[PDB]
Amino acid sequence: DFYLPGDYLLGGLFSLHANMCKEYEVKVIGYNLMQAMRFAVEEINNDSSLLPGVLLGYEIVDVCYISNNVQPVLYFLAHEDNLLPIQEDYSNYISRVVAVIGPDNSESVMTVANFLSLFLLPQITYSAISDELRDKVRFPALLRTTPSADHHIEAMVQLMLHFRWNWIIVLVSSDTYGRDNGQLLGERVARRDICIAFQETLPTLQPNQNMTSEERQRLVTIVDKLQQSTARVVVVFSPDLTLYHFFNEVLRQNFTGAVWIASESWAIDPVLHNLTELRHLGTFLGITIQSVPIPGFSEFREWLNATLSFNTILRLSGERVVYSVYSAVYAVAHALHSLLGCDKSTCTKRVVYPWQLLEEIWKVNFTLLDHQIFFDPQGDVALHLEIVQWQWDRSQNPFQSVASYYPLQRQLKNIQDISWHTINNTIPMSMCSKRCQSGQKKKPVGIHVCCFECIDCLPGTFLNHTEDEYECQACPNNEWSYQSETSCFK
């Protein structure tokens, strides 16, 4: 199942086991993604209008998260008999593969790109988001079929604008993911009149281990700081396999009431979703990728032990990332079809150096399941995002849609109803300072602009809101006014 001969071959790097490579707990996400790739290949073969005569094959290999990164690339780049020449011009090097469907994690993506750049071998990734991957000088041969992180942050900020929230807490993990995302969100917020109360770093731990007293003290202090501030909206940038202990600690105390705005990492996860006691902490919102049904996929998939265990979950979810692999395969197929010059029923066959496919790939345009597939100049395809709420009744899905996001417009649209946790389905409130009365001025307090105090003006003065709101003007002439008057009564 990990090989099929053909005239032209494709590479694949998925994380089947991630927790030698045959020594860790299985990961079903890798399996259904690989199934998506294989299904796409067979479908292209069946059709008789995309590529007549030219068969297509694949060559898949595991990566074990960030464990195995050098051998697969050296394997893909080798004429045959496992020997790779070293020279000063690879313009006539006919490699084994013609393109790579890059790995899942960002660090592995960068490591593989730093190798494949020399040969300009096209590489498409399907789940790695980081603005550093848009620098087409360091990475001249990398493309992506999912939006970057600035769009996730934009969705967060616009959600916080729609409902009036300008007092929030941010928590981050101790790695590049959390650091970069937190810095980006801070930069974005600084320009939109929203505040940050404080920020804290979650100690890095793993499930199935024992912690020291120091880490437990750190978690206790963090939660104690959480349960003293007036902000009631927490944004968490961190990966799963670290939040179990944190949420257990929060459950141990009685911190009730908050909107937990998640991120892509743990927005859709079952293992942390099954902690039944979580339901009474507050609303849980996340940002994910909109799901596109793929006609006739469960037939190819169902027809291994872990897949059956969560087959119900893989039915409710799992369709959120397969469209990326599907689209990448089809993009490579169309680029090849354009390059070879084939027609409705005639093909030519020819030598295809890898650096030539890249030029055609850059300029593809076609429609797949009512979504256009064209690449922007930085190597991205604009796919809609989504915002999901965690529903605990098991009848319907456990991730229900609440809004849609449009990357080529930067706007949240079609916002539906959300079941809050307040008394009578009222909107939760998070603000630093309450609004002033009529006629009173503002007395600033602290360092955040959005925090202030109210003060009443004395007779002989009037407050012109159209002018300085921090100090009322002295009623001139013979006009007179008294306490709390924006108009004088000469």
Partner: protein, 514 residues
Amino acid sequence: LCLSQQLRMKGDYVLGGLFPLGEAESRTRPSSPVCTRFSSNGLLWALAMKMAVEEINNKSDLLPGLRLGYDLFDTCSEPVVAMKPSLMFLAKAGSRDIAAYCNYTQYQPRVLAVIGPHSSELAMVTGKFFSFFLMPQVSYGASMELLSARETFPSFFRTVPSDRVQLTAAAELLQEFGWNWVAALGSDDEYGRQGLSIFSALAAARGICIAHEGLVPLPRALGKVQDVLHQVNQSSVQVVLLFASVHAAHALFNYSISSRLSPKVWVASEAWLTSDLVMGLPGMAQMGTVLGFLQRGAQLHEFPQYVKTHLALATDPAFCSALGEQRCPQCDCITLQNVSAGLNHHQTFSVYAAVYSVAQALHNTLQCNASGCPAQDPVKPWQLLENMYNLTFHVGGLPLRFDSSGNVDMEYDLKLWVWQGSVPRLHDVGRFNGSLRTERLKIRWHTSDNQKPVSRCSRQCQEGQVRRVKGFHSCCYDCVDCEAGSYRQNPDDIACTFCGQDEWSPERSTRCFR
């Protein structure tokens, strides 16, 4: 000159090198770029390594009876060009091909170690590729704390202190002099980002925590620089930490002098504590005090003569004829002035020490004795990795040792800027081995009466006052006591309810009495 022909000497065991010999002044074909501009620092460092290898060969106690060799190469400070010679080092000896296998122990690399690049950016890229084969790599300039992890870089060693020791020393200075309230600023490179990430934890674990944490933009061909200083000026701090590269610091100080910013105590990194560009800026004497930490090390005292002698020898027509019996084609036309600017650099010692370390490790692994040394089959590159951890190698009468993480241990000196006219000078006031030892009567501060500046907060509001929490991580409190017009109903709830008409209450009143 005939320098470009002296970058390859045969031997029983061949070392490899990567130096930034050249600089370069849009990819459409898979072709290697070309650099032409000449840089003197790379050539000086290459000659330092050469000096080290010749010194080893001349001696008798080290590697008795065996002769080393080298193979130097250029990186151009670019991964694309640096990958090729890296791919060559790991190849079947005598051939022009590399093989694909499942693991090491099936390869026969043609080198034995690599004296790695000077840049951390290239160090990260090359270390991952080499760690697959377990080829020992020793770098002489790369100072980043990410490279100490032994799960991603098993075969990486460095002979320059890491960035953690400097920040720990800074934290201890701050803690001893009594400065809880500070502001931390860093550059917009990986340098500054990692520096801030380390320092935040080091401070939060010692009682210090920060009022603002910002990134100073790089001069990539100005508006943001205004915002950073506004936030600093809005917190009443008399200490600012600047962990930045030279250009960001230059921009920051240019802007600050152009306007009128108040004097403050600046704690510097090693990049801009000794940079003529910053020291020469007009008006800098009105910015305040400047402290920092500088490493202590020896310096090769025959290198200046060695360079002259070997350039003169290269001039000899006879030598070039015999020498015949190009990585850098642009270094055959230089003169003594083109290198005279940097014949006292402090990293020749680092290169020299790296070479000596690899030599001693090989000596031990071969079970060489003193004058003869046992007959055995060639030592594979992955066999020296066991004698390199915990290795005590003497270089220039200064014992040194590697650790489990792969780092060496070096001391530090505390430098202060003292003005005598318009020329600043660097004096010494302290030392840092594992605990700071400062001297306080030898400091001339920037204040009127020569008294220690104060930047402090309050971590516990006394009973009878309200407390407003402040800080970037919510540590300190701004205490305020309500007048004789309200109670202190609760320790929390920062607000004072007014007394009743029948009640009476003074300032610092828990309740109003009738």
